[PDB]
Symmetry: C3
Subunit: 78 residues, 3 copies
């Protein structure tokens, strides 16, 4: 039981760290895309000239992921 | 038992969301790299002039990850 | 018991793959940011001119994540 609880808690702990890292990376990718679009403007080109550069709507399921994560912690660590 | 099953199902649910987000981010990073390489060309430079810019072969274990994920769901949610 | 062990092992296996992919992606994002900063220099602009471009300190909890992952494997697969 406590062995099970130990496995589950390691998993939530690790997942917490990983989710924060992934959030950080998405943030950075979007900043980078905006920088690229400024450079394209500087060359007299619009974002529509390069595949994907107009798009800032990446998959972002933070809301459902964070809710599930919280439920998981409450479920596991009670 | 159902408590165990509940933990495991929350984990597969969350992981599903996270895998889709990571796929999305890798996609975007590669598009961004291609855009950078077009700009370097515009300046009269090749991708070999900037560290890593020639490389589009990121770690992509989607095939093994997706198989494991499917096995995990079938194993857990039966 | 072995069913539990099977679930847990699938989870560590999948997580191992995913962590390597995320590491790879962060690497790439940082290389891309450096490339963008070289292009900004080429245009006579510093990184402070574009949001986030001076920053190479993304969330990187690889040390704690890798330790937890190793503990998880030892805990689960013993
Ligand atoms: Cl990027």
């Amino acid at each position: 039981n406590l062995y099970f609880q130990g496995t589950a808690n390691l998993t939530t702990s690790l997942l917490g760290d990983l989710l924060d890292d992934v959030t950080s990376i998405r943030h950075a990718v979007l900043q980078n895309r905006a920088a690229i679009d400024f450079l394209l403007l500087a060359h007299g080109h619009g974002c529509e000239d390069v595949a994907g550069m107009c798009s800032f709507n990446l998959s972002d399921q933070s809301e459902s992921i964070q809710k599930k994560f919280q439920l998981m912690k409450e479920h596991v660590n009670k």
